[PDB]
Design goal:
- This protein is α+β, with helices and mostly antiparallel strands.
- The protein has two domains: 76 residues, Helix Hairpins, CATH 1.10.287.180; 80 residues, Roll (Chitinase A, domain 3), CATH 3.10.50.30.
- It is built from three helices and six strands.
- It has a four-stranded antiparallel β-sheet with strand order 4-3-6-5.
- Strand 3 and strand 4 form a beta hairpin.
- The relative contact order is 0.16.
- The PDB classes it as transcription.
Length: 156
């Protein structure tokens, strides 16, 4: 349920974050918690407490990111082996009443609505994983029963 593969692009980000976190926001957060204490009482002060949390949360991701950088795996792959869906592949799919929605498959670690918003350890990513330019893919979930048609695969 935890997958190491990560795009080259996505890698740059993870690095970027740890950078922004340790060099740019840790300074900001620690600085406020400072004044907070100088300013007064611990409980009634909401900013002393809020900032303590964001700093606990901040150093937390700092920890996670750091380890995922070393254990993550990059998938530098271009158009040569194409046709089949597997990774970093922008896929288009169809619904009978007309539901059309795009998506490229990339890892959960760093996915946001920015580059591609589908993780590989995901149902759709599983069904659609390796299927030709026009197969009939299925997906199941609690109330979710679903049929989809693979339209086009674009790797760029």
């Amino acid at each position: 349920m935890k997958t190491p593969l990560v795009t080259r692009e996505g890698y740059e980000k993870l690095k970027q974050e740890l950078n922004y976190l340790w060099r740019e926001e840790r300074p900001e957060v620690t600085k406020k918690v400072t004044w907070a204490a100088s300013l007064g009482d611990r409980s009634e002060n909401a900013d002393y407490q809020y900032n303590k949390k964001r700093l606990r949360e901040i150093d937390r991701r700092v920890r996670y990111l750091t380890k995922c950088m070393e254990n993550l795996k990059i998938v530098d792959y271009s158009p040569q082996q194409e046709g089949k869906v597997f990774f970093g592949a922008w896929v288009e799919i169809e619904n009978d009443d007309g539901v059309t929605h795009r998506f490229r498959i990339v890892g959960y670690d760093e996915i946001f609505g920015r580059k591609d918003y589908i993780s590989i350890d995901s149902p759709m990513a599983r069904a659609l994983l390796k299927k030709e330019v026009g197969d009939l893919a299925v997906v199941n979930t609690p109330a979710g029963e679903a049929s989809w048609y693979v339209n086009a695969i674009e790797y760029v």
